[PDB]
């Protein structure tokens, strides 16, 4: 369709799912994939291996764009932060820079009460 060859990769690494989205510099989405969309459910979805194959699916989805360099920005504290980065680097995409974009409030909003188990 369209040729851009350069974008930025957003990873949302929660404690239950990991989402990998490829977007350009302007911030317009090009292709996304999730660990839960690859057949992983329950405990398996929250595994780093689920995010590992999820990134490969995203790379397969965005292979049409022919992107070489991408920027990885880590959002969320859950596991699978490193796994997606390795898969993107191992998929042929050149790693440009890695930054953390985890939203940290400055004592803004009250958080939900901790669950008692």
């Amino acid at each position: 369709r369209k040729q851009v060859s350069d974008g930025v990769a957003h990873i949302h690494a929660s404690f239950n799912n990991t989402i990998v989205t490829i977007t350009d510099r302007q911030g317009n989405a090009l292709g996304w994939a999730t660990a839960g969309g690859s057949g992983f459910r329950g405990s398996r979805k929250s595994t780093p291996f689920a995010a590992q194959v999820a990134a490969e699916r995203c790379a397969d989805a965005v292979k049409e764009y022919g992107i070489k360099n991408l920027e990885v920005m880590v959002k969320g504290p859950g596991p699978g932060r490193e796994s997606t980065i390795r898969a993107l680097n191992a998929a042929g995409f050149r790693i440009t820079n890695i930054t953390d974009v985890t939203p940290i409030p400055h004592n803004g909003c009250r958080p939900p009460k901790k669950r008692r188990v």
């Binding site: 504290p77 953390d100 985890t102 940290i104 409030p105 009250r110 958080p111 939900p112 009460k113 901790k114 669950r115």
Partner: peptide, 30 residues
């Protein structure tokens, strides 16, 4: 930045954190 998300993910009662701060203060004395 991962040490702050562990603290901000779930709300803690202000009396709870106050006791932990006092416990930490007396722990560093050795």
């Amino acid at each position: 930045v991962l040490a702050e998300v562990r603290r901000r993910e779930f709300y803690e009662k202000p009396t709870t954190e106050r006791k932990r701060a006092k416990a930490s203060a007396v722990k560093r004395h050795a």
